[PDB]
């Protein structure tokens, strides 16, 4: 009761937000944000400790991360380690945590009815944790699993490298993840007891004065106040001074430096970094966001436009980057063409030229006003968040903003400060520049190796003559400030719900040219709409060449429209356009206001598109590398790719695609585009703040624009063919084996093909997947330690389904095969032995997952789109299937497992894909497995088997 230091004033929110908020500070120093939502399906809480990796002891790298994993392992009130995860498993909840350089954030979600139970378990870890020594080894192996995952990832390698080139005395040079070496091998050699140092670090840094708690639930602000006071007033205050790092990790000796790095994928990137002071205090004016907007701009007269026109880069990322408290960065990152890689000095000269233009022309208030106005719209009409991510995020921002500004934080801009823009800009100079070039052209040309990832690199001082040239940069007439953004929305009217509005999408047009699904939004009432279009053409996937031409076409289309579309994206109007195995997919999402102008520009450009030869050659080269770079993808990704090729009627391989790519000449592409658009079928979904008439008007405008400019005619119904799944023989087992040449981990996908999708077959598979879900993770991952990726669940494709297992392990594929099979028998027992109460808990847990209500329009549109892309159109599926699921018995599941999934099942349809590790050679009792039929040639495999029928669509 007197355990509250203060209660904040009104928590500034959007008028559209019905959730009720209350900010307060407990006597111990804990900053609190309470969120009352009587409608919420799930309740949630989050605690963020303002201590992270940058505070790790130098002798124990990754200790903050280690403590994150250890803290939630038993308490005095709840001594069992399983208690927290078990309680959330039993009440449709989840939990997760993350460690950054200055924060350790713990969070969970649970069924709205069980907030007190869940929060009670959570709070105890912050009162009397036990840090159980039984799980010490397994948590160390978990931390090591995470680091080993990131070792071959080019982004994590670059992330650590930057840290290695700065001041080695600075906490910024620290390795924050940790691994087996830093948490076991080195402490043991050095005579460090990990447990006493863990306990030590905890005692010194885990103080309430550095903690922020966020609670979201059905309960009122008052009941939420009472609960948070009850469970968090006991958090010990040690009055810890919040760590600051005001010295920049890049001093004079770390500047005017050039780095030459070797990547894993065939990627070519340039990274330009300027050390800057911490700009967080100026958040109400945000001069870094201001400069980020201009330097990063993609509209006409932009730095990017000229860099692209010069044929040097394709993409650009610019602006402020976080460091820690006391130090930040201003970055200008570009990818490089083959010509760009030879014109790095020229690229950086253009970057400095652009910076100089902003200096000569000075700050612009109209630009800042535009940013302010866009941010206000974006905040006002922000989509509703899933509570788990909402609490976690707020727990962090509580440490940086007054209680009342916690929601507006990342949005509201106020005073224009030209003084600060001038200040930040004055730091963007050649004397302060850091350059990093990433390219395979440096293989065998480097002398240094980064210890944690093995990254190969060289370091050079940039010559004074180069710095002088960049300092002396002329003024370029190609660079001009962006003009006023005509995509800024103004019409925010929510259209009244029509008399004839429907709960699900309805077919409001069914012609030879198009099938139109429409639903006026009756849930979110934000001034937005989602416009999904599926274009069908037999010429988009007829052969590898055409598949490449479909891809090149849309990539060049997007490239040409970019300068125009960028203003729309800044204004909350975005689109996606990609080729499919059937034609093209187009999606326009955001504010409905200017939506038809963007859409009409896109349909027009599709049909009157004139290709720039220089861009075509550059996009073709980037696509060749992209096809090659798949070799550097994870072995499980490879295993899942090989199974889609094997099981789909028609599927062109990356090898066939890259082989036909050389035959894509410009005259062939120019000929392809009219041929592709000559005959189409359009299937659309228009969902949102729109009427039935407006929907018809949109569809009609897309047809009319194509008919006018491309002379489009409808396709024949007989031409609208969908690919079938390969029908496996009863009691058959096939294996397809390949090698991953990059990763030293194995990849596997095991598919037990069941049958064609139907209400009954769907829920047999979904309930069996629900039953074995937690156990497969506990047995195969927790107990057996097979690998970081242990996945099980239903697999659905082309109207067909089955059960799959996906594993990425150090162990061989044939071994994982016997382990999965061992588990299948272990579950045969576990189902016969479980109680009816336990069985009914699985049915309830599935029904809850299946009825999870979308929190935003996009999530609902995606669910409707799923029904459309599969041609099933079962919009009421969830309700029907849940109702059917509740009528299932334990016997039904036993009958099904016996007929389809058991080792001795009469209708067993097994197909495995084995992806060997880079260096790889070519417990419960595992059952006797037959000799597999090995697949040498995919064409012959496919030819030798029947093809399933295609699922019959659900009709009104």
Ligand X SMILES: COC(=O)NC[C@@H](Cc1cnc2ccccc2c1)c1cc(CCCCCc2ccc(NC(=O)[C@H](C3CCCCC3)N3CCC[C@H](N)C3=O)cc2)ccc1F
Residue 406 contacts residue 397 (beta carbons within 8 Å) = yes
Sign (positive/negative) of CA torsion 837, 839, 841, 843?
negative
Nearest approach, Cβ of residue 673 and its own copies (Å): 13
Binding part of the chain for its own copies, among 231-239, 382-390, 486-494, 716-724 by CB under 8 A, reads: 716-724
Closest Cα partner for 861 from 515, 589, 604?
A: 589
Residue 27 contacts residue 209 (beta carbons within 8 Å) = no
CB atoms within 10 A of CB 239: 10
CB of 716 or CB of 934, closer to its own copies: 716
The conformation of residue 167, written as its DSSP 8-state character, comes to -
Q: Both tokens of residue 926?
A: 């595992």
CB of 60 or CB of 328, closer to ligand X: 328
State which of residues 45, 54, 161, 462 lies at the interface with ligand X (CB under 6 A).
161
Residue 93 main-chain phi, psi, to 5 deg: -120, 180
Coil, helix or strand for 258? Answer: strand
Report the alpha-carbon distance of residue 869 to residue 362 in Å, rounded.
51
Does residue 719 bind its own copies (CB under 8 A)? yes
CA distances from 151 to 248, 778, 835 (A): 27, 26, 45
CA distances from 232 to 181, 237, 310 (A): 36, 11, 60
State which of residues 115, 118, 331, 699 lies at the interface with ligand X (CB under 6 A).
331
State which of residues 259, 517, 535, 541 lies at the interface with ligand X (CB under 6 A).
259
Nearest approach, Cβ of residue 276 and ligand X (Å): 12
Report the alpha-carbon distance of residue 557 to residue 535 in Å, rounded.
15
331, interface contact from Zn ion, ligand X, its own copies, none, CB < 5-8 Å by kind? ligand X
CB of 418 or CB of 538, closer to its own copies: 538
679, interface contact from Zn ion, its own copies, ligand X, none, CB < 5-8 Å by kind? its own copies
CB of 652 or CB of 764, closer to its own copies: 652
CB of 162 or CB of 867, closer to ligand X: 162
State which of residues 8, 187, 318, 482 lies at the interface with ligand X (CB under 6 A).
318
Does residue 271 bind ligand X (CB under 6 A)? yes
State which of residues 55, 99, 207, 333 lies at the interface with ligand X (CB under 6 A).
333
Binding part of the chain for ligand X, among 292-300, 631-639, 649-657, 713-721 by CB under 6 A, reads: 292-300
Q: Both tokens of residue 643?
A: 């199974």
Nearest approach, Cβ of residue 939 and its own copies (Å): 5
Please list the residues that pair with 536 across neighbouring strands.
583, 681
State which of residues 155, 360, 928, 955 lies at the interface with ligand X (CB under 6 A).
155
Does residue 162 bind ligand X (CB under 6 A)? yes
State which of residues 296, 489, 544, 747 lies at the interface with ligand X (CB under 6 A).
296
Report the alpha-carbon distance of residue 621 to residue 314 in Å, rounded.
12
Does residue 273 bind ligand X (CB under 6 A)? yes
Report the alpha-carbon distance of residue 494 to residue 821 in Å, rounded.
55
Nearest approach, Cβ of residue 99 and its own copies (Å): 48
- Give residue for tokens 């652009």: 354
Report the alpha-carbon distance of residue 698 to residue 508 in Å, rounded.
12
Residue 74 contacts residue 13 (beta carbons within 8 Å) = no
Does residue 434 bind ligand X (CB under 6 A)? yes
Nearest approach, Cβ of residue 387 and ligand X (Å): 25
161, interface contact from ligand X, Zn ion, its own copies, none, CB < 5-8 Å by kind? ligand X
Q: What's the CA dihedral at 648, 652, 655, 657 to 10 degrees?
A: -160
Residue 279 contacts residue 288 (beta carbons within 8 Å) = yes
Does residue 946 bind its own copies (CB under 8 A)? yes
**In the sheet where 456-461 sits, what is the strand order?**
316-324, 327-335, 269-277, 434-438, 257-261, 456-461, 448-449
Report the alpha-carbon distance of residue 272 to residue 369 in Å, rounded.
28
Q: Which residue is nearest to Zn ion (CB)?
A: 146
Coil, helix or strand for 797? Answer: strand
Report the alpha-carbon distance of residue 794 to residue 901 in Å, rounded.
12
Report the alpha-carbon distance of residue 168 to residue 251 in Å, rounded.
11
Q: Which H or E run includes 733?
A: strand 732-739
720, interface contact from its own copies, Zn ion, ligand X, none, CB < 5-8 Å by kind? its own copies
State which of residues 50, 308, 393, 679 lies at the interface with its own copies (CB under 8 A).
679
Q: What's the CA dihedral at 727, 792, 392, 148 to 10 degrees?
A: -110
Does residue 656 bind its own copies (CB under 8 A)? yes
204, interface contact from ligand X, its own copies, Zn ion, none, CB < 5-8 Å by kind? none
Binding part of the chain for its own copies, among 164-172, 295-303, 344-352, 534-542 by CB under 8 A, reads: 534-542
Binding part of the chain for its own copies, among 476-484, 487-495, 688-696, 943-951 by CB under 8 A, reads: 943-951
State which of residues 187, 217, 319, 799 lies at the interface with ligand X (CB under 6 A).
319
CB of 158 or CB of 684, closer to ligand X: 158
| Strand boundaries in 456-543, DSSP class E | 456-461, 506-510, 514-520, 528-536
CB of 375 or CB of 782, closer to ligand X: 375
Binding part of the chain for Zn ion, among 142-150, 569-577, 718-726, 938-946 by CB under 5 A, reads: 142-150
Helices (H), 234-364: 287-295, 303-309, 344-361
State which of residues 432, 502, 727, 760 lies at the interface with its own copies (CB under 8 A).
727
Q: Both tokens of residue 663?
A: 């035959």
Query: How many chain residues touch ligand X (CB under 6 A)?
Result: 23
Does residue 938 bind its own copies (CB under 8 A)? yes
State which of residues 165, 337, 530, 757 lies at the interface with ligand X (CB under 6 A).
165
Residues that bind Zn ion (CB under 5 A): 146
Residues that bind ligand X (CB under 6 A): 155, 158-159, 161-162, 165, 259, 271, 273, 289, 292-293, 296, 298, 316-319, 321, 331, 333, 434, 436
Residues that bind its own copies (CB under 8 A): 538-539, 542-544, 650, 652-653, 656, 659, 663, 671, 679, 713, 716-722, 724, 727, 937-939, 943-950, 952
């Amino acid at each position: 009761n007197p355990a509250i230091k203060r209660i904040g004033n009104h928590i500034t929110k959007s008028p559209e937000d019905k959730r009720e908020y209350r900010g307060l500070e407990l006597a111990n120093g804990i900053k609190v944000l309470l969120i009352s939502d009587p409608t919420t399906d799930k309740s949630s809480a989050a605690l963020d400790v303002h201590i992270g990796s940058l505070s790790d002891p130098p002798n124990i790298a990754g200790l903050s991360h280690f403590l994150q994993h250890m803290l939630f392992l038993g308490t005095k009130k709840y001594p069992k380690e399983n208690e927290y995860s078990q309680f959330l498993s039993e009440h449709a909840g989840s939990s997760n945590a993350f460690t950054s350089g200055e924060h350790t954030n713990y969070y969970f979600d649970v069924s709205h009815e069980h907030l007190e139970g869940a929060l009670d378990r959570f709070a105890q870890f912050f009162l009397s944790p036990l840090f159980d020594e039984s799980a010490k080894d397994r948590e160390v192996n978990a931390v090591d699993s995470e680091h080993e995952k990131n070792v071959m990832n080019d982004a994590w390698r670059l992330f650590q490298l930057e840290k290695a080139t700065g001041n080695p005395k600075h906490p910024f040079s620290k390795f924050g993840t940790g691994n087996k070496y830093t948490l076991e091998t080195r402490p043991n050699q050095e005579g460090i007891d990990v447990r006493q140092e863990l306990l030590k670090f905890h005692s010194a840094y885990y103080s309430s004065n550095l903690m922020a708690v966020v609670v979201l639930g059905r309960e009122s602000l008052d009941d939420l106040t009472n609960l948070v006071v009850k469970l968090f007033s006991e958090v010990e205050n040690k009055n810890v001074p919040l760590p600051e790092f005001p010295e920049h990790p890049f001093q004079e000796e770390h500047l005017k430096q050039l780095y030459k790095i070797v990547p894993i994928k065939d990627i070519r990137n340039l990274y330009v970094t300027f050390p800057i002071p911490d700009l967080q205090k100026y958040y109400k004016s945000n001069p870094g966001h201001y400069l980020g907007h201009l330097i990063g701009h993609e509209g006409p007269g932009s730095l990017l436009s000229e860099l692209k026109s010069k044929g040097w880069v394709n993409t650009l990322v610019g602006g402020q980057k976080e460091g820690a408290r006391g130090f930040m960065f201003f970055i200008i990152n570009v990818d490089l063409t083959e010509e760009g890689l030879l014109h790095v000095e020229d690229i950086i000269l253009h970057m400095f030229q652009y910076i100089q233009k902003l200096r000569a022309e000075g700050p612009q208030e109209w630009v800042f006003q535009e940013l302010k106005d866009l941010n206000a719209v974006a905040f006002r009409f922000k989509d509703k968040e899933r509570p788990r991510g909402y609490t976690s995020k707020i727990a962090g921002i509580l440490h940086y903003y007054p209680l009342e500004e916690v929601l507006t934080a990342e949005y509201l801009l106020e005073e224009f400060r030209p003084d600060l823009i001038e200040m930040v800009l004055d730091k963007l100079r050649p004397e302060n520049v850091r350059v990093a070039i990433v390219s395979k052209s440096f293989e065998g040309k480097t002398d240094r190796t980064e210890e944690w990832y093995g990254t190969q690199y060289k370091q050079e001082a940039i010559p004074d003559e180069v710095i002088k040239k960049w300092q002396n940069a002329d003024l370029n007439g190609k660079f001009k400030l962006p003009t006023k953004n005509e995509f800024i929305p103004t019409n925010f009217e929510i259209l009244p719900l029509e008399k004839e509005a429907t709960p699900y999408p309805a077919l409001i047009k069914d012609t030879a040219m198009s099938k139109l699904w429409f639903k006026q939004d009756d849930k979110f009432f934000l001034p937005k709409a989602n416009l999904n279009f599926e274009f069908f053409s037999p010429f988009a996937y007829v052969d590898p060449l055409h598949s490449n031409m479909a891809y090149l076409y849309l990539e060049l289309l997007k490239d040409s429209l970019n300068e125009y579309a960028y203003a729309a994206e800044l204004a909350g109007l975005s689109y996606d356009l990609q080729n499919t195995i059937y034609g093209m997919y187009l999606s326009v999402k955001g504010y409905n206001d200017k939506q038809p102008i963007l859409l009409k520009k896109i349909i027009e450009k599709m049909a009157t598109f004139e290709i720039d030869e220089k861009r075509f050659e550059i996009i073709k080269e980037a696509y060749m590398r992209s096809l090659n770079n798949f070799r550097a993808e994870q072995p499980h990704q490879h295993a899942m790719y090989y199974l889609r090729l094997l099981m789909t009627e028609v599927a062109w391989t990356k090898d066939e695609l890259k082989e036909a790519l050389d035959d894509v000449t410009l005259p062939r592409l120019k000929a392809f585009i009219p041929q592709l658009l000559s005959r189409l079928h359009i299937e659309a979904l228009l969902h949102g703040n729109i009427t039935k008439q407006a929907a018809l008007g949109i569809m009609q405008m897309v047809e009319d624009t194509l008919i006018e400019h491309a002379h489009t005619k409808p396709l024949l119904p007989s031409q609208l063919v969908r690919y079938r799944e390969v029908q496996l023989p009863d009691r058959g087992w096939f294996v397809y084996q390949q090698r991953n040449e990059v990763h030293n981990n194995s990849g596997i996908e095991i598919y037990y093909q069941t049958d064609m999708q139907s209400t009954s077959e769907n829920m047999f598979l979904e309930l069996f997947a629900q039953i074995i879900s937690e156990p497969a993770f506990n047995t195969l991952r927790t107990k057996e330690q097979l690998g970081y990726i242990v996945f099980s669940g239903p697999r659905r494709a082309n109207g067909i389904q089955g059960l799959r297992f996906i594993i990425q392990s150090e162990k061989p594929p044939h071994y994982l095969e016997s382990r999965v099979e061992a588990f299948l028998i272990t579950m045969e027992k576990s189902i016969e032995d479980m109680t009816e109460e336990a069985f009914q808990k699985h049915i309830q847990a599935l029904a809850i997952r299946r009825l999870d209500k979308p929190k935003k329009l996009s999530a609902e549109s995606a669910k409707y789109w799923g029904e459309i892309i599969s041609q099933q159109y079962n919009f009421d599926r969830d309700n029907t299937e849940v109702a059917y699921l509740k009528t299932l018995t334990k016997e039904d599941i036993i009958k099904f497992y016996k007929e389809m999934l058991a080792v001795d099942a009469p209708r067993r349809h097994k197909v495995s894909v084995h992806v060997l590790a880079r260096e790889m050679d070519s417990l419960s009792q595992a059952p006797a497995l037959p000799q597999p039929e090995v697949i040498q040639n995919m064409t012959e495999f496919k030819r030798g088997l029947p093809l399933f029928p295609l699922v019959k669509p659900h009709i009104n």
